[PDB]
C-alpha cells in the first residue's frame, strides 16, 4: 500500500547532557565527539602533551595516569617504542624531533652520515635506510664513477 507511512521511535541525547568535557559549555553542533564517558566539541578534545585533536585518525585515544594522549605521545611517555633512528636511544617526552620520511631523529642527530655536517634549511639529501646523505656527498661519489 502506498498509503502506508512509517512511524519511527527516536531516542535522542537529552539537550541538558550536551555539555562539553573540555570547555564546560553547551554543544549545539550537529557533529561532535564521544570519549571517556563525556561529550566534546571537535576542537575541545586535545592531547595533554601536544594538544592535537585526539581521534582524527584511528578513532582512539590513550588514557593513562590521568592523561589523555595521542599514539606517539603515549609511546613517548610509557612505551619502549620511541627510539631515535640515528643513535638508537629513547626519545624523551617534551622533546622536539626531526622526521625525515618515516624515520625519527634527535635534532643533534640530524646530520649527514658521511661528512657528519649538520643539515641546514633547504639542503638536498638522500635517505638510505636510516642514513641521511647530503647532496655534496652524492655528487662526489658520482664524480668518480660517472
Amino acid at each position, epitope marked *: 500500500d502506498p498509503s502506508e507511512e512509517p512511524v519511527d521511535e527516536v531516542l535522542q541525547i537529552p539537550p541538558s547532557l550536551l555539555t562539553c568535557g573540555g570547555c564546560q559549555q553547551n554543544i549545539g553542533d550537529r557533529y561532535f565527539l564521544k570519549a571517556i564517558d563525556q561529550y566534546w566539541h571537535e*576542537d575541545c578534545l*586535545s*592531547c595533554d*602533551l*601536544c*594538544g*592535537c585533536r585526539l581521534g*582524527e585518525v584511528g578513532r582512539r585515544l590513550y588514557y593513562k595516569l590521568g592523561r589523555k594522549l*595521542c*599514539r*606517539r*605521545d603515549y609511546l*613517548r611517555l610509557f612505551g619502549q617504542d620511541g627510539l631515535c633512528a640515528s643513535c638508537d636511544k629513547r626519545i624523551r617526552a*617534551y*622533546e*622536539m*624531533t*626531526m*622526521r*625525515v620520511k618515516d624515520k*625519527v631523529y634527535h*635534532l*643533534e642527530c*640530524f*646530520k649527514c652520515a658521511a661528512c657528519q655536517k*649538520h*643539515f*641546514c*634549511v*633547504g*639542503d638536498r*639529501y638522500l635517505l638510505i635506510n636510516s642514513d*641521511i646523505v647530503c647532496e655534496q656527498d652524492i655528487y662526489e661519489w658520482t664524480k668518480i664513477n660517472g
Partner: nanobody, 127 residues
Framework: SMAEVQLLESGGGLVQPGGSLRLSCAASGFSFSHSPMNWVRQAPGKGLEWVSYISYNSSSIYYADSVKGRFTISRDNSKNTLYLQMNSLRAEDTAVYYC?????????????????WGQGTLVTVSS
C-alpha cells in the same frame, strides 16, 4: 588544484645585549588554523635548534630551556600569523630564525623544507 605553501618571516635585525625584537610570520598555502607551529634557529657550523612550539588552538605551548622567561610565542589564526616576542636578548641568541610547520601529532618537525619551512629572518646580538 594544489596551493603552494608560503611562510614569510619578518622582524629581526641588529641590537645590543638586553635588547628586544618582535618576530612575525605570515602563512598561506595550508590550513594554518589546524597546524602546530614552531620557531627554530640556526648559526653556521651549529645544528638546528628548536626554540618554541604552539598547538593549533594555543592550548599547548613549549620553550627551549635557553629561552624560557625571555621569549614568548603566540599566534593569530584569523590573520594566519605566528609571533615571537624576544626579550632580554644575549649574544648566544644570534642566528637565523625560521618559522617551522610541525607535524600534527606529538612534537615533530620534518625535513620537507618547501612545504614546512620559511626562508628565515636574521637575529644578531652584538658582542
Amino acid at each position: 588544484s594544489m596551493a603552494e605553501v608560503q611562510l614569510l618571516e619578518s622582524g629581526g635585525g641588529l641590537v645590543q645585549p638586553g635588547g628586544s625584537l618582535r618576530l612575525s610570520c605570515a602563512a598561506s598555502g595550508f590550513s594554518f588554523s589546524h597546524s602546530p607551529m614552531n620557531w627554530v634557529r640556526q648559526a653556521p657550523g651549529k645544528g638546528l635548534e628548536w626554540v618554541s612550539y604552539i598547538s593549533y588552538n594555543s592550548s599547548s605551548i613549549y620553550y627551549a630551556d635557553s629561552v624560557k622567561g625571555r621569549f614568548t610565542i603566540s599566534r593569530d589564526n584569523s590573520k594566519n600569523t605566528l609571533y615571537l616576542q624576544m626579550n632580554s636578548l644575549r649574544a648566544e641568541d644570534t642566528a637565523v630564525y625560521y618559522c617551522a610547520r610541525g607535524l600534527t601529532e606529538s612534537l615533530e618537525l620534518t625535513a620537507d623544507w618547501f612545504d614546512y619551512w620559511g626562508q628565515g629572518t636574521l637575529v644578531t646580538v652584538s658582542s
